[PDB]
Coordinates of C-alpha atoms in Angstrom, one line a residue:
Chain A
X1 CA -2.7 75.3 -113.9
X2 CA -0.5 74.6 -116.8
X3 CA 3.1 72.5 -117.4
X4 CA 4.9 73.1 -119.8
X5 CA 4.4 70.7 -122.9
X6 CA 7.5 70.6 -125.2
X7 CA 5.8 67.9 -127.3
X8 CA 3.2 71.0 -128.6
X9 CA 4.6 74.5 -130.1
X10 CA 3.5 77.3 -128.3
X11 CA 5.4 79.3 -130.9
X12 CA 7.7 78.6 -133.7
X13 CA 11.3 79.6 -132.3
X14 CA 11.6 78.7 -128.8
X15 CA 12.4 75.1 -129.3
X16 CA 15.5 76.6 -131.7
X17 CA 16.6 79.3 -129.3
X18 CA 16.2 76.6 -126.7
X19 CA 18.6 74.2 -128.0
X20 CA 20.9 77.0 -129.4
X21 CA 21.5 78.2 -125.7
X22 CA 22.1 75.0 -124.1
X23 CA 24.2 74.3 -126.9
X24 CA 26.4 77.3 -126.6
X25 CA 26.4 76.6 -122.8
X26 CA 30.5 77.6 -121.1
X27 CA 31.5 78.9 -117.7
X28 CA 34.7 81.0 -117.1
X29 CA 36.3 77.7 -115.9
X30 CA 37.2 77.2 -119.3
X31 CA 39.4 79.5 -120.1
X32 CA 42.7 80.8 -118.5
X33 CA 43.5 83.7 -118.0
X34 CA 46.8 83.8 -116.8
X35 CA 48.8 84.1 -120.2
X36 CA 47.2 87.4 -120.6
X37 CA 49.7 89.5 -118.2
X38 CA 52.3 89.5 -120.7
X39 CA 50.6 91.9 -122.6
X40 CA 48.7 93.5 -119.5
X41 CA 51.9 95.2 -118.9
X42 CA 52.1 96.3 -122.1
X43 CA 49.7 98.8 -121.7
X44 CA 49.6 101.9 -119.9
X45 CA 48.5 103.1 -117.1
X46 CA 45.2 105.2 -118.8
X47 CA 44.7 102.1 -121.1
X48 CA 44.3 99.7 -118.1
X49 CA 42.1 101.9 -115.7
X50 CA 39.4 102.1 -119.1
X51 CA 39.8 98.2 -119.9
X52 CA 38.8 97.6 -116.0
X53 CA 36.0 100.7 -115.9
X54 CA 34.3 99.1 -119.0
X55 CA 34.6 95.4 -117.9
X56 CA 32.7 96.9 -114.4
X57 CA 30.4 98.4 -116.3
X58 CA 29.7 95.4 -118.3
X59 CA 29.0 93.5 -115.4
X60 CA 26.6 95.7 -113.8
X61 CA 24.4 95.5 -117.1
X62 CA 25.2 91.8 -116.0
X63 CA 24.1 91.6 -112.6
X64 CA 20.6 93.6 -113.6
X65 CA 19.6 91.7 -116.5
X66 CA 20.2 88.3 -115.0
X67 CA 18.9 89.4 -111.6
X68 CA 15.9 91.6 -112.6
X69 CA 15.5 92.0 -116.3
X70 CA 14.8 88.4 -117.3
X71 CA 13.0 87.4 -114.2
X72 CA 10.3 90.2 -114.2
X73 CA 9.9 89.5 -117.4
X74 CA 9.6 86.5 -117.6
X75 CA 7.4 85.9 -115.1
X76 CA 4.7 87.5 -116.6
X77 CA 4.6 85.9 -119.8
X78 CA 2.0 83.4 -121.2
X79 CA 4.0 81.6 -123.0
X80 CA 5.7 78.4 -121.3
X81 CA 8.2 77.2 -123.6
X82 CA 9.6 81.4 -124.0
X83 CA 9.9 81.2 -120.4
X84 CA 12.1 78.8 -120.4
X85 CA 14.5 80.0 -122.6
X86 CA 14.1 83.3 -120.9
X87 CA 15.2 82.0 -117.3
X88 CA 18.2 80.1 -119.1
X89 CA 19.5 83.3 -120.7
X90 CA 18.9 84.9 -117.4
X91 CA 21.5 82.2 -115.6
X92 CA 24.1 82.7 -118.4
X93 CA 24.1 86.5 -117.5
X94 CA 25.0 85.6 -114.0
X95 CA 27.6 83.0 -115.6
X96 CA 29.1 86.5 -117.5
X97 CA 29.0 88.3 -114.8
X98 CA 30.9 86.2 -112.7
X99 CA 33.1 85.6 -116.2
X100 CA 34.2 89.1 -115.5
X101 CA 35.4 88.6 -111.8
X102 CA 37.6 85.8 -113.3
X103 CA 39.2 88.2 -115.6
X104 CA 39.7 90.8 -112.7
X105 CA 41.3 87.9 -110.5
X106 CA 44.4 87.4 -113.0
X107 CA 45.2 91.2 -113.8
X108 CA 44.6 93.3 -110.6
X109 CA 45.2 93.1 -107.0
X110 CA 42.0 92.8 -104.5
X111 CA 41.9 96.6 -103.6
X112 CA 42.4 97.1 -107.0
X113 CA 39.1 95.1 -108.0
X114 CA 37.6 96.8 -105.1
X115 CA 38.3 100.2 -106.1
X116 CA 36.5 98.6 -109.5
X117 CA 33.2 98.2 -108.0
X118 CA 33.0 101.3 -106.1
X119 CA 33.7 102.9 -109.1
X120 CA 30.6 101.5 -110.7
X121 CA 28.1 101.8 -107.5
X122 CA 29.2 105.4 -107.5
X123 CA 29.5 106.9 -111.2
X124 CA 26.6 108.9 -112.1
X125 CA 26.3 107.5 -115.9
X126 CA 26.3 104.2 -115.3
X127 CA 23.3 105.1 -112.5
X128 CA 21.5 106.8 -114.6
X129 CA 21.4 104.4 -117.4
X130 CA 20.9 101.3 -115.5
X131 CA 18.9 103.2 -113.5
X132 CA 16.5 103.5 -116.8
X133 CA 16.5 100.2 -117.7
X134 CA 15.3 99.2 -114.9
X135 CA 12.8 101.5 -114.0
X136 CA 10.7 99.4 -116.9
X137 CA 11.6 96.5 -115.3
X138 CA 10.3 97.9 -111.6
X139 CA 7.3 98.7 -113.5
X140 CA 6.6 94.8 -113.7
X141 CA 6.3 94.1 -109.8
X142 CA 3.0 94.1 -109.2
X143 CA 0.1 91.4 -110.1
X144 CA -1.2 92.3 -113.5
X145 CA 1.1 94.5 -116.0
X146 CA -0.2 95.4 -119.4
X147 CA 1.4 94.2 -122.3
X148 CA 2.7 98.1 -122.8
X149 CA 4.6 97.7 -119.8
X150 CA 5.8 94.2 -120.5
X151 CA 6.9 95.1 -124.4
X152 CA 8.5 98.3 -123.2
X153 CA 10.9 96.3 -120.6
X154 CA 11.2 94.0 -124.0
X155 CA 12.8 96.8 -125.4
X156 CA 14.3 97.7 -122.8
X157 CA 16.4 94.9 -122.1
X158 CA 17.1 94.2 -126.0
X159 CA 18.1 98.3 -126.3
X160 CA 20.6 97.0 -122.8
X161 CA 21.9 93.6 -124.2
X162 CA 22.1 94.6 -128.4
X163 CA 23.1 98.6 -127.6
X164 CA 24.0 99.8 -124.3
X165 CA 27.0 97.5 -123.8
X166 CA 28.7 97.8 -126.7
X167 CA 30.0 100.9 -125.3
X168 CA 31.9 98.1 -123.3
X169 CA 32.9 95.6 -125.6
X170 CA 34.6 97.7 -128.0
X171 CA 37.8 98.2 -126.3
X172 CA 38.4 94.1 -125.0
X173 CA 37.7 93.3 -128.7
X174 CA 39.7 96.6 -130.1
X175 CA 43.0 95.2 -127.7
X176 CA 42.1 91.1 -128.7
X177 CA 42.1 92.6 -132.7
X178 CA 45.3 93.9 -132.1
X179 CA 46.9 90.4 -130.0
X180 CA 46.6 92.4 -126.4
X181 CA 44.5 90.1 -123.6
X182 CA 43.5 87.7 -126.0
X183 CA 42.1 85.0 -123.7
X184 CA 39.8 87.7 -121.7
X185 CA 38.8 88.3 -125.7
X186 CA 38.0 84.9 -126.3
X187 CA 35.6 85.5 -123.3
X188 CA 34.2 88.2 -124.3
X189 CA 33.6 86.5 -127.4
X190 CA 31.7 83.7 -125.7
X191 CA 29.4 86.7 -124.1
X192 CA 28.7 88.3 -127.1
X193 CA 27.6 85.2 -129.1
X194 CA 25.3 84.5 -126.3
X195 CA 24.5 88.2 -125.8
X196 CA 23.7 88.1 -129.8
X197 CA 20.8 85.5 -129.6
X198 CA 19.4 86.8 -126.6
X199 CA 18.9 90.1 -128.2
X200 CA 17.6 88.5 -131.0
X201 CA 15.0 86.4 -129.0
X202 CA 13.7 89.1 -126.7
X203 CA 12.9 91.3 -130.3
X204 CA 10.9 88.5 -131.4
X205 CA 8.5 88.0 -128.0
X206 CA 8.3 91.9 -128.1
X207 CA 7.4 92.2 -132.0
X208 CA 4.7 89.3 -131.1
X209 CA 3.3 91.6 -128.0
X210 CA 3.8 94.5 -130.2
X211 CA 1.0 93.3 -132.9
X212 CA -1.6 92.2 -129.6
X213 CA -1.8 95.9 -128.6
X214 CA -4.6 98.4 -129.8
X215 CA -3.7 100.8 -132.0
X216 CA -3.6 103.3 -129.6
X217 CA -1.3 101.4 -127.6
X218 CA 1.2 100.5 -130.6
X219 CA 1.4 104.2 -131.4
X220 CA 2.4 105.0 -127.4
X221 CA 5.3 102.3 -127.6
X222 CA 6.3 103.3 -131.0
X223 CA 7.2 106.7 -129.5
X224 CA 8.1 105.8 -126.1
X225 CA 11.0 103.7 -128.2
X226 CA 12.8 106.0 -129.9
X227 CA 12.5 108.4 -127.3
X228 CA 14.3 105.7 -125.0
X229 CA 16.7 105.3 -128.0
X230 CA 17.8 108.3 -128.0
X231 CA 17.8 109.5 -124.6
X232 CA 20.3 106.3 -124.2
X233 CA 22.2 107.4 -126.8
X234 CA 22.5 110.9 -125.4
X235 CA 23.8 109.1 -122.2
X236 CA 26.1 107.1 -124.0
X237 CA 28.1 109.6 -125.8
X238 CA 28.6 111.2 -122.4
X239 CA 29.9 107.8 -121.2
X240 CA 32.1 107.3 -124.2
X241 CA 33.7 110.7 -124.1
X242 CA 34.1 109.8 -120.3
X243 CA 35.7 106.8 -120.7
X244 CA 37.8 106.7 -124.0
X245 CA 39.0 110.7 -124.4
X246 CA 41.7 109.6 -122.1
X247 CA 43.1 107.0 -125.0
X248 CA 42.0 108.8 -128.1
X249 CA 39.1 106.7 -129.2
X250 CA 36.1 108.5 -128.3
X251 CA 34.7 108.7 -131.9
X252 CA 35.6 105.3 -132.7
X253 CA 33.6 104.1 -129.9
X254 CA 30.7 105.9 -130.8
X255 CA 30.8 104.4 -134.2
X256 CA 30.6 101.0 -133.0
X257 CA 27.5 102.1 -130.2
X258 CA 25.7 103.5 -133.6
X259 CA 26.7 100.1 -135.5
X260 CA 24.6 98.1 -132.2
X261 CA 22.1 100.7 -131.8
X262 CA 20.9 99.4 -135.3
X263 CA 21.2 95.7 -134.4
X264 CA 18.8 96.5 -131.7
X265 CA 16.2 98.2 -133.6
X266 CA 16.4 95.6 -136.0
X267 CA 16.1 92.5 -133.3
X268 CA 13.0 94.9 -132.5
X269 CA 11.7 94.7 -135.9
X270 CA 12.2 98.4 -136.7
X271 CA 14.7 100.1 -138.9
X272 CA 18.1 101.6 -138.4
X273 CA 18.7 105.4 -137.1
X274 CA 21.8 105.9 -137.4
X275 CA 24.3 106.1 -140.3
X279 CA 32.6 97.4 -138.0
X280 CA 36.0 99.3 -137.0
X281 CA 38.7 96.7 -138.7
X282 CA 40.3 96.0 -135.7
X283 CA 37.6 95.5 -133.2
X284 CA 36.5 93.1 -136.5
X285 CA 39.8 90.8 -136.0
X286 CA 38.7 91.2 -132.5
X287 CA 35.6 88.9 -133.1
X288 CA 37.7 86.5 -135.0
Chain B
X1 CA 24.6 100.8 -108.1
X2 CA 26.1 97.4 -107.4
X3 CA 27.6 95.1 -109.7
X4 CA 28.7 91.5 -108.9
X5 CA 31.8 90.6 -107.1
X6 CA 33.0 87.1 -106.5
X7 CA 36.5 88.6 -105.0
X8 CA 34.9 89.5 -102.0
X9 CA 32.6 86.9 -100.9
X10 CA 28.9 88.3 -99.4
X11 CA 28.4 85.2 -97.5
X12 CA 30.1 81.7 -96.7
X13 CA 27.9 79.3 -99.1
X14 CA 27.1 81.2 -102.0
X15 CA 30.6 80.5 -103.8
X16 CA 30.3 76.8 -103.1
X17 CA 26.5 76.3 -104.0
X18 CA 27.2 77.9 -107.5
X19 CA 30.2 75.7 -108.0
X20 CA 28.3 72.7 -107.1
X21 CA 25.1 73.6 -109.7
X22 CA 27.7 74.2 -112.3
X23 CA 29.7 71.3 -111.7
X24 CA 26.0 69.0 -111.4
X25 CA 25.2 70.7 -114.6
X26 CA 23.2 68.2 -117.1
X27 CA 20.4 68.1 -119.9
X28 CA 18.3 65.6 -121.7
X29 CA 19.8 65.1 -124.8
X30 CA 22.5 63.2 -122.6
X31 CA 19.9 59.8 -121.7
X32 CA 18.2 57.7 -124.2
X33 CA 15.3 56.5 -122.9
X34 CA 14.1 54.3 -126.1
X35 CA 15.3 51.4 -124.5
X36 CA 12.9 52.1 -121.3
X37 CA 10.2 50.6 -124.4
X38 CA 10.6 47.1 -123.0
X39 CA 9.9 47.2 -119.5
X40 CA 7.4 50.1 -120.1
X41 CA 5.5 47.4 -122.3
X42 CA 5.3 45.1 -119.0
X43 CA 3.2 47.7 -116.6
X44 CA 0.0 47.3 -116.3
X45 CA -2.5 50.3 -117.7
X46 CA -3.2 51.2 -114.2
X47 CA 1.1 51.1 -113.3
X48 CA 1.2 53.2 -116.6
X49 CA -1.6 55.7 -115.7
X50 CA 0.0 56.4 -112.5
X51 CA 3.2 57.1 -114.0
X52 CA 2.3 59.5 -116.6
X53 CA 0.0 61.1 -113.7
X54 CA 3.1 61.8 -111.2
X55 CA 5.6 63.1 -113.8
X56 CA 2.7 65.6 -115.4
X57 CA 2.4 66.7 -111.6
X58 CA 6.5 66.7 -111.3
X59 CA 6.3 68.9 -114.4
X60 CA 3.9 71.3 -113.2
X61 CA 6.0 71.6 -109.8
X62 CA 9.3 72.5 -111.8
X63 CA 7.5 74.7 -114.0
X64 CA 6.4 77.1 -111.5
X65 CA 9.6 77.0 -109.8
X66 CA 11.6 78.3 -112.6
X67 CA 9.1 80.3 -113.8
X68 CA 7.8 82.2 -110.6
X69 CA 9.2 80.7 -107.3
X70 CA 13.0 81.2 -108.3
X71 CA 12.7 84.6 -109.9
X72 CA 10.2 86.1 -107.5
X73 CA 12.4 85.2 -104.9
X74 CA 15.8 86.2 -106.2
X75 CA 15.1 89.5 -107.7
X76 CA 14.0 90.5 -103.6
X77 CA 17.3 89.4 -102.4
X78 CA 20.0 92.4 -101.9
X79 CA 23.1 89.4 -101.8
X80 CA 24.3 89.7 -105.6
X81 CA 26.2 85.9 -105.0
X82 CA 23.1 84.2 -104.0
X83 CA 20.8 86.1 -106.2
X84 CA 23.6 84.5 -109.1
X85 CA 23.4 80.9 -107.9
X86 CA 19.1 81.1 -107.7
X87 CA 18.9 82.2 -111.4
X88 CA 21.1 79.2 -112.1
X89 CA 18.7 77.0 -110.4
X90 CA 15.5 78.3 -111.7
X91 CA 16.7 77.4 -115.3
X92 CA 17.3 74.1 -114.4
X93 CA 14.3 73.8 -113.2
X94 CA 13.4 74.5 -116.5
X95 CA 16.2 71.5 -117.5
X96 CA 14.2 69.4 -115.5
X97 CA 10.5 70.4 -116.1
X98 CA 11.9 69.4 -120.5
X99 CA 13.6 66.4 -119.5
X100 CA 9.7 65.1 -118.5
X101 CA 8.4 65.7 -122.1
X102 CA 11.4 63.6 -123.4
X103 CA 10.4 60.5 -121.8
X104 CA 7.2 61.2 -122.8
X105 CA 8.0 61.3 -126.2
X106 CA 9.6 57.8 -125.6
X107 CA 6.6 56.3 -123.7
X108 CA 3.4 57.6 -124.8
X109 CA 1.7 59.0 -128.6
X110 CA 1.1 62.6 -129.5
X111 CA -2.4 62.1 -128.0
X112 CA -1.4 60.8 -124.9
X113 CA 0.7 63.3 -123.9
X114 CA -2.1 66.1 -124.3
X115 CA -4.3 64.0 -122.3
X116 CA -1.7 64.2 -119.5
X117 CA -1.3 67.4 -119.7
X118 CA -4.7 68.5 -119.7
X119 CA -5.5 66.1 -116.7
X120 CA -2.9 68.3 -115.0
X121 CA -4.2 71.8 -115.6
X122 CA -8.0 70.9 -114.6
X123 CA -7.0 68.7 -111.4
X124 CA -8.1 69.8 -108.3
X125 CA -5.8 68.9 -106.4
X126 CA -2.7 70.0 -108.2
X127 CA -4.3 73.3 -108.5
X128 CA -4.8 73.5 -104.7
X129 CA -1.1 72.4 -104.0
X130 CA 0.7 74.8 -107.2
X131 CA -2.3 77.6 -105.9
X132 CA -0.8 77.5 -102.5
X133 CA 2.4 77.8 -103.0
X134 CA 2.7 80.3 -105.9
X135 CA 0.9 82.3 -103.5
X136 CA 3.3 82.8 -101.2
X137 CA 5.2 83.5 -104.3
X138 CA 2.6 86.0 -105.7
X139 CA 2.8 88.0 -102.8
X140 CA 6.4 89.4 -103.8
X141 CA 5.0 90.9 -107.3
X142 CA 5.2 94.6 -105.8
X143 CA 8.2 96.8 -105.0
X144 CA 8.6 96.5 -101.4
X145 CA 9.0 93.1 -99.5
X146 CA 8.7 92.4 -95.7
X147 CA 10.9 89.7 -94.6
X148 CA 8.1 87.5 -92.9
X149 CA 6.8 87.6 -96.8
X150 CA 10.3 86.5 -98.4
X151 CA 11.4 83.9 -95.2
X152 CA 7.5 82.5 -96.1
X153 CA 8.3 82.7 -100.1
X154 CA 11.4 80.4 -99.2
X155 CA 9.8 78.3 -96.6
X156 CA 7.3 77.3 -99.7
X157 CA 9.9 76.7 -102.0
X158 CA 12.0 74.2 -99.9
X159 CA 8.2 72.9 -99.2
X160 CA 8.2 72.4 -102.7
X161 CA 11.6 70.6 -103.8
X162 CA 12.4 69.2 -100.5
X163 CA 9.0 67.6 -99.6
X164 CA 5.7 67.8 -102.1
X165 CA 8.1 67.0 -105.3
X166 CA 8.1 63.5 -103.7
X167 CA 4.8 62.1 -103.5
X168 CA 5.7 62.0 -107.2
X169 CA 9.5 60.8 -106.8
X170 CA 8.3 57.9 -105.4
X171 CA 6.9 56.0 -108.6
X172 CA 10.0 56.1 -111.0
X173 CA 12.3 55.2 -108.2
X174 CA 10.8 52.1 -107.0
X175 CA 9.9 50.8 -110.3
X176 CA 13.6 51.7 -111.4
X177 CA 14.8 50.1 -108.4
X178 CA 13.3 46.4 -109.8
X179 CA 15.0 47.2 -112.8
X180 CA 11.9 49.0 -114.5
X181 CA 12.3 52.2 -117.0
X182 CA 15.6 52.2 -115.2
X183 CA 17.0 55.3 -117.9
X184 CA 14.0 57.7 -117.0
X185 CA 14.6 56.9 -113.3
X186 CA 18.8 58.0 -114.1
X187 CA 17.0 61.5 -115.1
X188 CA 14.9 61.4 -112.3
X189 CA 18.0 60.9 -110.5
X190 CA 19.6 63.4 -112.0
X191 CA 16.8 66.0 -111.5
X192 CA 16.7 65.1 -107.2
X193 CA 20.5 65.5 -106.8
X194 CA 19.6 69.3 -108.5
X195 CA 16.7 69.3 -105.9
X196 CA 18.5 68.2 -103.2
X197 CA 21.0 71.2 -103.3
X198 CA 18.3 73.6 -104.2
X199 CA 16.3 73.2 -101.0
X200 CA 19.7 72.9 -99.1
X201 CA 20.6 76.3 -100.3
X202 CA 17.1 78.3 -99.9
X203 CA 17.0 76.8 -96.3
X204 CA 20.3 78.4 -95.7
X205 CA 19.4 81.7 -96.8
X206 CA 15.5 81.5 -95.1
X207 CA 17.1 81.1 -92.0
X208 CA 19.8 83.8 -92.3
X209 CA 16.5 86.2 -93.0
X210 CA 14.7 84.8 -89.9
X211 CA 17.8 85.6 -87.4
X212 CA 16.9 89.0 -88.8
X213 CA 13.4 89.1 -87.9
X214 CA 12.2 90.0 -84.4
X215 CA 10.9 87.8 -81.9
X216 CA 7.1 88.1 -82.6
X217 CA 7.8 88.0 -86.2
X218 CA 9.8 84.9 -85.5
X219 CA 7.1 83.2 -84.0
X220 CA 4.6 84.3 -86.5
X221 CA 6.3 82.4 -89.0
X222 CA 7.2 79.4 -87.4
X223 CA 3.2 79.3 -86.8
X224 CA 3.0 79.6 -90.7
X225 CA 5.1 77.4 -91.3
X226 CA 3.9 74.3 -89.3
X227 CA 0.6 75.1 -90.6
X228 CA 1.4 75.2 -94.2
X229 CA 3.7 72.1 -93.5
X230 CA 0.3 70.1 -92.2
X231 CA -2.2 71.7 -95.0
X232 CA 0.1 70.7 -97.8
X233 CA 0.8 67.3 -95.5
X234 CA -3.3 66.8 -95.7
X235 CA -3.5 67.8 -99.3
X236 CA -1.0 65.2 -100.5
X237 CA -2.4 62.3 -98.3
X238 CA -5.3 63.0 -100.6
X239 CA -3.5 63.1 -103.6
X240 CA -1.3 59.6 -102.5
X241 CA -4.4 57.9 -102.3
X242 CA -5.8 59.2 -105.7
X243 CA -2.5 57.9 -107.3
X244 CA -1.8 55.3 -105.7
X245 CA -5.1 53.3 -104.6
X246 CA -5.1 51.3 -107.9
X247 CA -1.7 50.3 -107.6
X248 CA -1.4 49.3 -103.5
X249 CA 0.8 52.0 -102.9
X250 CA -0.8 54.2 -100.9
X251 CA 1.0 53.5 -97.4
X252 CA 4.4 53.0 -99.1
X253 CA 4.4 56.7 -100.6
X254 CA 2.7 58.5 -97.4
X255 CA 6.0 57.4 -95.4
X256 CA 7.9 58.6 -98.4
X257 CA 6.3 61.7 -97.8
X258 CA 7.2 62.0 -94.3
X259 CA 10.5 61.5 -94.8
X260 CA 10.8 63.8 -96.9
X261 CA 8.4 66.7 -94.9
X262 CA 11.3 65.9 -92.0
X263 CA 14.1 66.8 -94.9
X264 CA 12.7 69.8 -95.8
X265 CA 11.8 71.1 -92.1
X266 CA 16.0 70.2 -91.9
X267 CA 16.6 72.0 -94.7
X268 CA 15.0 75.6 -92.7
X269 CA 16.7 74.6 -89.4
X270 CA 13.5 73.6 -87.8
X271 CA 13.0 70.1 -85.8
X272 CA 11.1 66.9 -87.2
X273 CA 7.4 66.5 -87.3
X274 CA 6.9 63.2 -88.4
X275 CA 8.5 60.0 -87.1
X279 CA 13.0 54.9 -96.7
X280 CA 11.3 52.0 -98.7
X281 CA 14.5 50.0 -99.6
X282 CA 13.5 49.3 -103.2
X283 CA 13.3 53.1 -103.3
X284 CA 17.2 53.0 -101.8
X285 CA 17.6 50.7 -104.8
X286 CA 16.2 53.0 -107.5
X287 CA 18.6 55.7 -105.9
X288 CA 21.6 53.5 -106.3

């Protein structure tokens, strides 16, 4: 039974993604929050009740990826060293996730972050669409998967971590782009950089499983993807409308999920569907 | 469906235990081992073939933990906090399991570390011990668990980084502790104080699930248990004896092991079985 030998390549790009993620290595420790309740108060009433329902749904994508996603796949890969890196990324998830209670912790009161996260167990969108995602994940408990099983929860946890939540980081970066909660932005920032390469990573070990697979089997998966694409993005647009009609930006957001959507095919290998908002740029800055 | 949330705590340990991995966090870019050249150079070929042999086995351990034993158990449990604080630990294990290769790259040529590493995967012995264990581990790969099969999943893993890691502990610890490859045995040190806490916490939460098990499920386990704790017990005696005849150690490491078998029984709640060497105490100094 094998160890893993970091002085022999199993591939080309874990020893860089590797490195990378330790290097980018943070925990919410870092950064205080506090300074952000001068402009908390700033906003309204509508404004804060979507900042909160996004952050909650961001860290339910959270709490699935680290806690299922990664380890199910994982587990069933051949490949030692991509292992690795997978279980890191699947630690810095939790890390996020628990970045988000921090944020909570400074701007709302504790039956305030508990109405939060009944919110999120309860609303039927974010069921459904977690409720997806992992479906291809559940499809991984058992002994022996086939590698259309395992490339399919490849795409679906890249479609989760390079699509799916940027429903959710639009508006933290939208408010940080215009000098509102800036030190939650910086934050999110940190997420998204490590969000970036894990997307990235995951579309590589699924375009490598993607060329083992009979032709047969390719064509299947081809399909079953931008069906999944799109029956996310139909769910989406529902959330969005949902979430941001209340503060006008319902159409902005859903430029910025079509913008990701993209990214996601293309960390997949596969080219754009769909057709950066200024602000939410200055945002990333 | 849930989401994580630290504001309201799901038990009294979780919060601390993920503090304390963060806090403990480490990786091997952080010890230069070049200078271990000159006492390394001083070993015999026998004191060097044992040495490569126990950390290729140490490997092997940690690279089945994070790759199967933490997430196989974690993505099982319904606590979100603890679930959080495994994943952590499983990618250290993965920390640990690359920290090996880097003394190797110090210590031996390209073509020594491949023989290692190939006397690991055809062993017998190491199979038998990584065979049992994982499959405890492989019994969790469908969607519904009993709790006799999670409590057993845990038992194995505290068997694991409590107890079997140590038959290979041994080695860099007492020649560190005259002085010997004294920055390998700092990551060695580094890697039990990760250990330590890991089969602290997994104890904890294997004997939360056995107060929810009933009696004559109780008492079926605690018969697994002392039974896998003797057939691992009878496997490592043989495997102390393969390591260690050459070198005269054989005795020193068995009551190493005992010690250790009386930790990890600790660890679960459960009484001693069994009834340190003080250059060992020095090494851990």
């Amino acid at each position: 039974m094998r160890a893993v030998n970091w002085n022999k390549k199993e591939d080309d790009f874990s020893l860089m993604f590797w490195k990378q993620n330790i290097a980018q290595f943070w925990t919410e420790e870092e950064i205080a929050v506090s300074s952000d309740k001068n402009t908390w108060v700033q906003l309204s009433k509508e404004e804060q009740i979507a900042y909160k329902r996004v952050l909650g749904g961001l860290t339910l994508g959270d709490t699935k990826q680290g806690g299922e996603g990664m380890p199910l796949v994982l587990v069933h890969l051949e490949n030692l060293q991509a292992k690795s890196v997978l279980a890191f990324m699947g630690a810095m998830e939790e890390v996020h996730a628990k970045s988000y209670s921090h944020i909570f912790t400074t701007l709302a009161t504790e039956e305030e972050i508990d109405e939060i996260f009944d919110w999120v167990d309860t609303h039927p969108l974010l069921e459904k669409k977690a409720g997806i995602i992992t479906s291809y994940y559940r499809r991984l408990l058992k002994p022996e998967v086939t590698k259309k099983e395992l490339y399919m929860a490849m795409v679906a946890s890249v479609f989760l971590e390079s699509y799916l939540f940027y429903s959710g980081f639009f508006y933290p970066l939208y408010l940080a782009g215009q000098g509102k909660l800036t030190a939650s932005g910086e934050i999110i920032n940190l997420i998204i950089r490590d969000e970036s390469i894990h997307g990235v990573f995951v579309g590589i070990l699924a375009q490598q499983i993607f060329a083992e697979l009979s032709a047969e089997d390719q064509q299947e998966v081809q399909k079953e993807t931008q069906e999944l694409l799109m029956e996310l993005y139909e769910i989406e647009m529902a959330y969005t409308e949902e979430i941001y009609t209340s503060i006008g930006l319902v159409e902005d957001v859903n430029r910025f999920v079509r913008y990701n959507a993209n990214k996601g095919l293309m960390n997949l290998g596969l080219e754009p569907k769909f057709e950066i908002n200024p602000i939410v740029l200055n945002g990333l800055r």
